Amino acid sequence: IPGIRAQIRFIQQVLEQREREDTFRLKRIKGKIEAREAEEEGG
Amino acid sequence: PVQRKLDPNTPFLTGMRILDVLFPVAMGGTAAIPGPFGSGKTVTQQSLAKWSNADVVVYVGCGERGNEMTDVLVEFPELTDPKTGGPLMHRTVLIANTSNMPVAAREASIYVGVTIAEYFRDQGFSVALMADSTSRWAEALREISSRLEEMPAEEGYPPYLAARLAAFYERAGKVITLGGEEGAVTIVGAVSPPGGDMSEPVTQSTLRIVGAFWRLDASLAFRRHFPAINWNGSYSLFTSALDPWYRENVAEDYPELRDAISELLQREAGLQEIVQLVGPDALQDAERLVIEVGRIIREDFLQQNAYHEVDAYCSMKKAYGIMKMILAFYKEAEAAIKRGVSIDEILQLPVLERIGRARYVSEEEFPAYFEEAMKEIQGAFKAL
Amino acid sequence: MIQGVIQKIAGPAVIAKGMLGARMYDICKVGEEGLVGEIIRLDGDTAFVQVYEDTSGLKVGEPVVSTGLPLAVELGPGMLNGIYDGIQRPLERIREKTGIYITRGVVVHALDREKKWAWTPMVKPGDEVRGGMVLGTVPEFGFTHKILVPPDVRGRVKEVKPAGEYTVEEPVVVLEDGTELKMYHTWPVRRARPVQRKLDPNTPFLTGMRILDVLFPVAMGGTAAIPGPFGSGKTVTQQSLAKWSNADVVVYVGCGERGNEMTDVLVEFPELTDPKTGGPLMHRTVLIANTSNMPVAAREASIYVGVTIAEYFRDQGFSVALMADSTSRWAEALREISSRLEEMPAEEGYPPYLAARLAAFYERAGKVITLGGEEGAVTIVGAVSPPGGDMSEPVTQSTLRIVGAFWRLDASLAFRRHFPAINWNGSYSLFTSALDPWYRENVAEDYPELRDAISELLQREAGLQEIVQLVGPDALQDAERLVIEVGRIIREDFLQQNAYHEVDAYCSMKKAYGIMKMILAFYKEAEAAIKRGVSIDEILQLPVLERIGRARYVSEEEFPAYFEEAMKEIQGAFKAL
Amino acid sequence: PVQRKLDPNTPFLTGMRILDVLFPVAMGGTAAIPGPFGSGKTVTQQSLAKWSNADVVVYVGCGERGNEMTDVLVEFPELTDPKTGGPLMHRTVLIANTSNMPVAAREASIYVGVTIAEYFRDQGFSVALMADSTSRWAEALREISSRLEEMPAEEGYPPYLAARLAAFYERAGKVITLGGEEGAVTIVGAVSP
Amino acid sequence: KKEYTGITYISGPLLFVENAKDLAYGAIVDIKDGTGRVRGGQVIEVSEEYAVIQVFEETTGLDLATTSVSLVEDVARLGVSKEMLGRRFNGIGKPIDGLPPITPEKRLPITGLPLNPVARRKPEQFIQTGISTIDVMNTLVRGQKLPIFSGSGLPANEIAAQIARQATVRPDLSGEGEKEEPFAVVFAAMGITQRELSYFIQEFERTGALSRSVLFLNKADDPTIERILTPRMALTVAEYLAFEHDYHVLVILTDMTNYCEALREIGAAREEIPGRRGYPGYMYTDLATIYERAGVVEGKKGSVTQIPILSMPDDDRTHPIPDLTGYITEGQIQLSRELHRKGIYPPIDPLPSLSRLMNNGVGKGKTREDHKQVSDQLYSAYANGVDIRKLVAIIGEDALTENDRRYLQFADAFERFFINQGQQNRSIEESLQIAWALLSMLPQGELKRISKDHIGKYY
Amino acid sequence: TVAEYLAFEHDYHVLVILTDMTNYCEALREIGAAREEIPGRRGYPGYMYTDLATIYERAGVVEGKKGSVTQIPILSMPDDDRTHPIPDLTGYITEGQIQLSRELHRKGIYPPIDPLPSLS
Amino acid sequence: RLMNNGVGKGKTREDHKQVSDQLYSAYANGVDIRKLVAIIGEDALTENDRRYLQFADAFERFFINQGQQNRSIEESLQIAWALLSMLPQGELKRISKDHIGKYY
Ligand SMILES: Nc1ncnc2c1ncn2[C@@H]1O[C@H](COP(=O)(O)OP(=O)(O)O)[C@@H](O)[C@H]1O
């Protein structure tokens, strides 16, 4: 039982780790989109 | 447009014993065959395309293999459709779009296929769409979104995936068109998860909208146990409106036989849990009998090789015959085990191999083969 | 402050136009009707204003007025026996207007501006007053309510008003600088009140529950944490504690919890007793209510408002007792606020504050000597109800190591009818060492050793029970069955308190000491008998067992005589057989 | 530049039994010693440095505590080179850049080490570079990248870590230089996950 | 009238209109094309330079030259009445039916105004559904939110229709004016397919339970904004009826998972940076906004009780949707896949079910005396049987005791007589009679939770 | 700073003791994460090794002088993980570690120290 | 995948895919009995489970391991039939009785 609990803990940690990278890339994309649309008044 | 949409009340016979007896699909329905690579999401669709009961067939390939699409152009104008005798390529409108052609032609091909099928339905036939790997559609949308430079939802898929999929799956069903006739568009859309996990947005959004759902398993496909339909992750929602049709056209206690088979499978599962815990020798005799009947079912009634000569199209009466034989054998074996005879003798009874190989028969001598084997079982299991 | 017009309206965010001078974190009422918000950003000549209410139906061009004061409460006479929202809004006077709902933009004052009190001066002109001193007194029903000087004010008195009747808006003292001091003042909830110095734990917080007050104590500055499952009788424990504690005032804070505390407290304890006057217990309570569908700013300000009101009642010289409910629900609200502010999360989603705001709430509690030469205390007992019930999430992982005592309410113990249900194998306390001297000087001289012996008895009973049930409690040597029967005596007639009885709800320290003494004496005489070789059946059939079984149900007047007679009778009747 | 790159057919005898019997390394090859903290990586690398069969040794350290550098500094000059008989520190060019010193100097140190080893190969000897904490090097790369403000890869590191590591490890092998005489550059790069 | 031309951007769902600072945030507009066909909309992010609009259905055929936008309403309102008690609406609130559009008495706003925590009271009385499990072991008192945790293939629509047809309130036991308390039900279904729509219509108009129901249907391929608006319309009509005409209402919301997914999609298309596990950060507030409009107040006689039917997505209890739903509501009911496959209807797993407000709705003066004790004893005996079944499978009926034999037979008969009931309508007296008959199969002295004054008159 | 002063200038033998390096790491993660700088591993930023090494390596013994500095940083493994970033970085920087035990504490032993996983 | 079209009767030998299917089934059974052993113990095994176990080990030792030698389709099929003969007749439900009689 403790071995299975350790495995679960490791998998859960990795899965949660691979969400903050996504949030970070999304925030950067939003910053770039704001920087671009702040210059698109007309043209 | 149509006048009004009817309620489906007749099955969609497809040849496979699992997908006909256990998990049926009405003649207006929908389905989805998701699974990792190396399961047979193409062999099963080609078998549905060459052994169905429809009038026309449209085979859409949205990101498939060139060899997988050219092994149809070559063989189908040689086989004989099972309704008129002509070639099978006189009812197919297949729409090929392989994996190196342009990328927006994917969604283009999906919509073209559905509109052609609706035209034929309005004409009056009974079409059968077959969309392959709707996931390629999703990845095309993902690329076009990454070019539009927008804000993506989970895993990059744009935030209008589910709307497109619902609008595409909701133009399928029996209807009475503007000329006072009947038509039907059945859809069987494959799905390819990126790791096999049924948690992808496409694998989830394609639930909650469909009827049957035929989940393929990987280990059954490593054992070379085809088809690899997982018998406890799948489900069907049409199996309660088709019972009048079964009672009218197959048998009278076919629903009861189907219920008994399903109950036996999905009770044997629980015992298999304790089996894997302790071992299949500390069990009682009735328990080992249940395990062995489950294995006989799993290897003689839910297995089907699409490359045999006569075991590639099993009809309803043949499936019902095999089910009857299995149930009678189990009943008499239960009685004998109560009496006291041993399970090893019960297994060495050669009616085992008889009702096992009873599936490689043709369809002409079965009405006599089944009678002979039934009487032989009834005799030999009271002889001892 | 100068007004300003709206520029953009996107969801709950509003961007003001023409505010060159507005401060950060100020309440400003945006709109035509007042939708009090909060200034969170300033960029050149604008200000982002986070509104609390719906924001639907506004237009661009409506005025935005600032206030200048960052989310204060109104500390004064009138808060006893009141129900308040998260931002100190009186719910009854709100119901008097809007019907049964809570409309948008209502404006109501916390302290009633139309009641009259009996002011009695306590100074004279030409006198010297500084922060934290007393100006007068006014009796609020139940006890005498002082009127402090607003901290960080001073001067020389010039004029007081004669004793009589005046409301909360008659300036009652006027200093030399011309400042007018009224009966109340405002204090921003995010800044702790100042004192002279913080004292140390040397006095217990006598609850009334024998388990807690004997085995797991907490000083009168402590910070305990009490989880709760769904069906372990937690509400009755909390109500008994608030009824028989030694606090002078009790403040209750709930952010997400029911609307049955209202009926329960307000109609049971009044028709029942406040066990020092007989009148309602709601005459020392400041209940605060918050359901799930109320704004997140309301939830956060709820926690902080509770602790600030408690700090005030301490600074008056009393001893307060807080009961924070669902710190987990508070953390949920805080996480929602954060994810709205577009902040990089941490493990489990909570922002990287959950460990700092928590420790900024639990560190406002402790015995202290106020600014006017007095004594005060604030003690907190905050519930921690995880979504699943695992003490490994971030909220619990921080609450533990921020708190002292810990009281593990369990549900199986409740299913076995063992009330109260506090698992002694999982609970623990840290206020025993530094509290022993009070025990030696005020209870008895061997109280520590009696307590430790009882704890060892329980430890050994459990360690034995590990394998008892295998072969049944009959195939063990006589010492083992003796240990088991003594453990049963302990945990069935000392560690169990029927909180609904009349004379069995408040076991005093001397009473608990006597009971422990009798149980240990019976164990000593039973081991002295077994050592000689008597049977293990007379031991259990004796009458001293029943005599000590009816110990706790006796009153607090006849207990010394009962104790003497019981010890004499045990020592007597344990030699004849 | 070199003439042509030979193929190693000679063992690199380090002294230890496991690494000279079970898992040997040809005298032109590469290796790696990953492993968690407190397992003996420093002691193993110093033992290779003080008992190998190379002509010269170039100890690089980028992120290792200065106590190790001081250990080798105050220990070697009283040992003996087991090929000639002189002091051991007369065939060592150790390079030191500890943890508290600046960061980018880490990668500067890696490259300086490899270039010194290439020179001593070009003279006709057979050297044995022993890097340390290529993981620390990758951390320095990540810091500089995140300052440049570019998009990351799996777990922060920039998406050219693999190319950089491949070049660094591919500068190692037995070769027959422009003078005609042979030479070799072994490499033993520690890692610390 | 037909003002506000001059748009300057069109992409996907969005549409930027140039200078228009007279539209209120959150309004509702229409978009007339250059060919006549009109559409819907909803203003958001209005500022001084432009005003982002979001169309309802689609945007195929719009151009920057021939396009105009016009106002409809400053907020979203619904025209409610009492004549809408045999009708069938959809989404926005127009009739998908043949009957004419009714005339309203007041046009309420579809949201807002939470109840007051000092203007409530405590729910006491009980409601009868006909299903014997949800009666004898998981009672459903008024003013309670009791979700149903369905599954992927399990029958949820059929259970919903059965409850809707059968559920009534029993004033015979309390004692009051019979024809004084009416009953209604406001079934509202989001994201149904085409089969389920006809199934529901036939299931209602077969028995005739249409005379006191109001349906709000949201066929799956409709836009997402309507699937967001639907429960608001349902609950608005429900609490209007209750707190204005003393009705007793029962609201059933179908497949809250579809609502949650639509909500996440709308947020993403509005550029929200999802909070946790892809779902928006405000989802707890959003759910608690509709799981909370139902209760009982003091001074009135009505009540509103909710039964949100959701479906654990991957057969999981730690997914955010079931997590927050169990966090906000008080109770649960679990459909069982094993009982389904074995052939029992209605399949209700009675071990992991629960009802927090049950002990407040059963007892002398409400239903009967032996209610809670019978429930406790049935729970205990069923758990015992379900354990000794696996024990038997491993060891054999050779090494058992008589009490274990009897418990095994009890468990089997309980699964085959008390759960499996089909389309019957069991009253509470009939359910208790079946329960006592089933408990009789055990010897006295084993009924270690019932009182003897009860064992006497029964058993 | 005070330690290095007293030691290398007035010839003392200091002994620095830093309790709760975990609270320091929490403070560091919170102060850093407010500038949007690529959180490294489970929250804590990328340069946490650089910072911990910045403050640890200040303890040594110089030649010529006769002072010394000696550190004993007490830290609490967050959830008895020896694979948490804080204990991992600390073990990679410092030399030798003394690990308290949990089983010995139940049996009532003090100071509970299991000499199996500890060394210098 | 492109194997059912390139092998069979008239191309290599009329019994190729059948030996393939049977070898796969038998090896899967042996691999499962490996875990059964690891749970129970090698002496508490039925009389045919040991046959399957030994088939799996012989398969991994003679059919897979082949050094650097150039086999042929016929040599490899002879080895496959040698192995498949280690199991009893009648327990191979995949091959046809004709091939079963012709090769053994
Ligand atoms: N019904 C079947 N009978 C026999 N073999 C099958 C059957 N279905 C699939 N297979 C085998 O499984 C493989 C699956 O092929 P294919 O359908 O191209 O991949 P996938 O199933 O992953 O789409 C094929 O090589 C075929 O040999």
Numbering used by the authors:
A (entry chain G): 169 to 211
B (entry chain A): 194 to 577
C (entry chain B): 1 to 577
D (entry chain C): 194 to 386
E (entry chain D): 5 to 463
F (entry chain E): 240 to 359
G (entry chain F): 360 to 463
Q: Which text from the study accompanies this structure?
A:
The V/A-ATPase from a thermophilic bacterium, Thermus thermophilus (Tth V/A-ATPase) is a rotary ATPase that has been well characterized using both structure and single molecular observation studies. The Tth V1 moiety is composed of four subunits with a stoichiometry of A3B3D1F1 and it is responsible for ATP synthesis or hydrolysis. The Tth Vo moiety, responsible for proton translocation across the membrane, contains a central rotor complex (d1c12) and stator apparatus made up of the a subunit and two EG peripheral stalks (a1E2G2). In the holo Tth V/A-ATPase, pmf drives rotation of the d1c12 rotor complex relative to the surrounding stator, resulting in rotation of the entire central rotor complex (D1F1d1c12) and inducing sequential conformation changes in the A3B3 catalytic hexamer to produce three ATP molecules from ADP and inorganic phosphates per one rotation.
We reconstructed the 3D structure of the holo complex rotational state 1 using 71,196 polished single particle images. The final structure of the state one has an overall resolution of 3.6 Å. After subtracting the EM density of the membrane embedded domain from the density of the whole complex, we obtained a focused density map of A3B3D1F1d1 with two EG peripheral stalks and the soluble arm domain of the a subunit (asol) at 3.5 Å resolution. This map allowed us to build an atomic model of A3B3D1F1 (V1). The secondary ADP in the semi-closed site shows a lower occupancy due to low affinity of the semi-closed site for the nucleotide and partial flexibility of the complex. Upon dissociation from Vo, the isolated V1 moiety displays only ATP hydrolysis activity accompanied by rotation of the DF shaft.
